[PDB]
Design a protein around this nucleic acid. Structure first.
Ligand code: MG
Ligand code: MG
Ligand code: MG
Ligand code: MG
Ligand code: MG
Ligand code: MG
Ligand code: MG
Ligand code: MG
Ligand code: MG
Ligand code: MG
Ligand code: MG
Ligand code: MG
Lengths: 100, 205, 51, 144, 203
RNA sequence: CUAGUAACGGCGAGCGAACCGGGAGCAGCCCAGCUUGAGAAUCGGGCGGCUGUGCCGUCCGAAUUGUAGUCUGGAGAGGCG
RNA sequence: CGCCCCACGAGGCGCCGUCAACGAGUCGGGUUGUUUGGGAAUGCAGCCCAAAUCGGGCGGUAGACUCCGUCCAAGGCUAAA
RNA sequence: CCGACUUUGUGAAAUGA
């Protein structure tokens, strides 16, 4: 964003150069899900089913005990960063199966 | 151990006599590299002997941030704005580094002047004999072409030592530069403690 | 059997002298070329060289 | 110069200069610094005080670049300006010195200065460098 | 394009359908020899992405390996030495089982060269890998530019020398920065380099 | 060069790299995946010819559980010039 | 130096905004063992758990939140010094 | 020696939730 302060030490220290906005590259969309891959994954999801711990997540969420849902999801997957979003995804599956 | 001497750090408890590397072949590598350079020059005649063009870039690392050096290649932005296609730039003696990022106009125009200079004093033989297509060069000046030797576009490593003479103004004398220089250090120390009280100022009031 | 403390290739064969000390020594040698008594002492037959 | 080593003069003296009573065996004290805490204790705690133990906190992955502050005392600043642009100057007009162009980050305040004003333009300044430059009539311009 | 479908269906490895088909394949595999020629990949997508082609000369061989660590082969658990090298039962082999399978197939199959190998099925005692082998004397491989590079003599026994996908994994070549700077060109190369006493001429 | 340094070690003996910088040389590439479907456009082998490290014709086979072509993230595919 | 004359195919360049597909018992996590300078764990390996697509790996002290710098693995080839 | 996870699937009852 805006350039350095020009003063060698302190908040936003450094030497002043007129900063520049980088053109969009490939790999800034890296991971942006696409129409067909979403189609594929969603189709295969119910055909395969749900893994047993994911079913336990569904059960704990439909009880509403989100802390233990996250806890067991973390103990299965391994890290909080992915446990959190696995809980989000399974909460999404429960809203999309209590929508109807 | 005995009388006052440094605590030894001899790292010679392994079998170092199996891994001594002697440099008696130093003149030999000098001469072999020289021979290789002659036989590359004759082959790439009449290309420049230093190779393709290299960008002026800054070094990393606070110790050398101000000292410019030759980089690896021009970025895509730079090639595009100097009007030279991606796949053609390495062809005519211009390196390309798709991994660099241009973060400054100061860097971009600095290298764009180099691209323009290289295209200014570049000559390109036709791919065939009589057919002179677009981007080629005329025979009359093709006929004096030579192999430049050494660095054909030198890079100054630091900006020149220049000390002009100027007035000492009253408001320049009043400037407490050390007080200034302590104030932002104080702000950097207190940056968290300030923004926290701001955060709960919003959260409550 | 062996020799005591066998000779090894990683002796200090080449020694280093300061570049400025080489230059000083070449200066003193050039100066000593100019003095007829030094050449004649050093062993050159110079009784008929002009200057 | 083996023709000079004192071993050569010790030829014929049975003990090669290491004594008859206490002979010259392999390692009667141990390899290297053996027994710093035990029997070379007198040596280590007479000539190398502070050898044993931890002091201070660790610093994983230090780069020496992070700690780079080349410094110059005030006394040497005027050597940096050539005599011609010392002449092209008067009481109100003074030369400007970019120490970063000379390779210096901080400007420390040791020594005398001439009464002639000077505008040193640095990245870091001390208290005393500023006090001496101001008292000399110059000024400071902080850049980076 | 079906390979996205089949790849995702192999991503869901704890689903009921995959559990069924993978148990029954595990039984079929356990009833056959350790090294068996198989006509076609069971995982066409996985085979393709590693460089398999429905072309003559690319053969597929299913390899079985036992699981568990490498327990030290010494005459009674007696290891003559200092107490710090005296263990037996919790040592681990420094090559992964994928590599072990490749290095089994490579030895038994002399006239063919190992391209890749991929997991197919697993149980309590045996892992089953499918190893893609390439016949480099076969003209249909001599005439494919994407695979000639494997006919040059410098690619002999890649598996036996640590050059395949599993090879680079267990060599630790998957990484470039710190955490992986010692393993370039090899751990032994860097040890030699760091141990060479450089005695310059004018030292 | 960093550097016998940061770190590691009954923190004892000892052990010990990397970034930055300067040099030598510098070249980047190709796959898999959505994408001929009026139509396997691909490859091998036998036989035959010739100009012969291959090319061509014919007949078998491989292959649709995908050969060839386009693509590789720095992109790319489309449409206009 | 000589005959052979390079297209409606491909590329480059300019614009568009629509798509934009990218490697799984793999990463990643626990524990064990070895190894490292790598220290709440440097690589590797065994066993168990086991993914993600507004995502994933890093930023040398484990932890959660906010922001920022950076790169795109789990397929392959590549002289020169 | 024994404990847990794994190959390890099926349905049934009785006691705890
Ligand atoms: Mg020894
Ligand atoms: Mg005597
Ligand atoms: Mg003596
Ligand atoms: Mg004696
Ligand atoms: Mg004595
Ligand atoms: Mg005695
Ligand atoms: Mg004692
Ligand atoms: Mg030093
Ligand atoms: Mg060691
Ligand atoms: Mg070992
Ligand atoms: Mg470990
Ligand atoms: Mg390779």
């Amino acid at each position: 964003s805006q350039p350095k302060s020009g003063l060698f030490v302190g908040i936003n220290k450094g030497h002043v150069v007129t900063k520049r906005e980088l053109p969009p590259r490939p790999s800034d969309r890296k991971g942006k899900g696409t129409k067909r891959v979403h189609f594929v994954r969603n189709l295969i999801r119910e055909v395969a089913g749900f893994a047993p711990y994911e079913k336990r997540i569904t059960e704990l969420l439909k009880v509403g005990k989100d802390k233990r849902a996250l806890k067991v999801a973390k103990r299965k997957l391994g890290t909080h960063k992915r446990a959190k979003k696995k809980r989000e995804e399974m909460s999404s599956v429960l809203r999309k199966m209590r929508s109807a | 151990v005995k009388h006052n001497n440094v605590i030894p750090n001899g790292h010679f408890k392994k079998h170092w006599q199996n891994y001594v590397k002697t440099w008696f072949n130093q003149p030999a590598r000098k001469q072999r590299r020289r021979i290789a350079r002659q036989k590359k020059a004759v082959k790439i005649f009449p290309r420049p002997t230093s190779g393709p063009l290299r960008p002026i870039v800054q070094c990393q690392t606070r110790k050398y941030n101000m000292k410019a050096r030759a980089g690896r290649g021009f970025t895509l932005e730079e090639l595009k704005s100097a009007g030279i296609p991606k796949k053609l730039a390495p062809t005519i003696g211009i390196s390309v580094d798709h991994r660099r990022k241009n973060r400054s106009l100061e860097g971009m125009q600095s290298n764009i002047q180099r691209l323009k200079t290289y295209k200014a004093k570049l000559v390109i033989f036709p791919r065939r004999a009589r057919k002179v297509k677009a981007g080629d060069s005329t025979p009359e000046e093709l006929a004096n072409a030579t192999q430049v030797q050494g660095d054909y576009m030198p890079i100054a490593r630091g900006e020149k030592r220049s000390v002009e003479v100027v007035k000492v103004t009253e408001e320049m004398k009043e400037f407490k530069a050390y007080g200034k220089l302590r104030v932002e250090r104080m702000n950097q120390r207190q940056l968290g403690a300030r923004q926290k009280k701001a955060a709960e100022a919003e959260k409550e009031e | 059997g062996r020799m005591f403390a066998p000779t090894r290739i990683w002796r200090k064969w080449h020694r280093r002298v300061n570049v400025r000390l080489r230059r000083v020594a070449v200066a003193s040698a050039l100066a000593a070329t100019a003095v007829p008594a030094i050449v004649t002492a050093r062993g050159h037959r110079i009784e008929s060289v002009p200057e | 110069t083996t023709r000079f080593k004192k071993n050569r003069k010790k030829r014929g003296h049975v003990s090669a200069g290491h004594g008859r009573v206490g002979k010259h065996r392999k390692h009667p004290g141990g390899r290297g610094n053996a027994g710093g805490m035990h029997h070379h204790r007198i040596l280590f705690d007479k000539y190398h005080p502070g050898y044993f133990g931890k002091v201070g906190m660790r610093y994983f992955h230090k780069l020496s670049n992070r700690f780079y502050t080349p410094t110059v005392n005030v006394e040497r600043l005027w050597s940096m300006v050539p005599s011609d642009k010392a002449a092209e100057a008067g009481g109100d007009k003074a030369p400007v010195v970019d120490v970063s162009q000379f390779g210096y980050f901080k400007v420390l305040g040791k020594g005398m200065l001439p009464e002639k004003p000077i505008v040193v333009k640095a990245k870091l300044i001390s208290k005393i460098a500023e006090k001496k430059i101001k008292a000399a009539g110059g000024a400071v311009v902080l850049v980076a | 394009g079906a390979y996205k479908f089949v790849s995702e269906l192999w991503r869901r490895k704890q689903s009921d359908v995959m559990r069924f088909v993978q148990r029954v394949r595990c039984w079929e595999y356990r009833q056959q020899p350790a090294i068996v020629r198989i006509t076609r990949p069971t995982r066409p997508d996985r085979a393709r992405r590693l460089g398999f082609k429905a072309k003559q000369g690319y053969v597929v061989y299913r390899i079985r390996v036992r699981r568990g660590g490498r327990k030290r082969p010494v005459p009674k658990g007696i290891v003559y030495g200092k107490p710090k090298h005296q263990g037996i039962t919790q040592l681990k082999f420094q090559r992964n089982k994928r590599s072990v399978a490749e290095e089994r197939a490579g030895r038994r199959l002399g006239g063919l060269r190992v391209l890749n190998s991929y997991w197919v099925n697993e149980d309590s005692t045996y892992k089953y890998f499918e190893v893609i082998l390439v016949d480099v004397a076969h003209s249909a491989v001599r005439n494919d530019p994407r695979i000639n590079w494997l006919c040059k003599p410098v690619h002999k026994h890649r598996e036996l020398r640590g050059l395949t996908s599993a090879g680079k994994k267990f060599r630790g070549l998957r990484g470039k920065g710190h955490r992986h700077h010692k393993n370039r060109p090899s751990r032994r190369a860097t040890w030699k380099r760091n141990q060479t006493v450089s005695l310059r001429r004018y030292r």
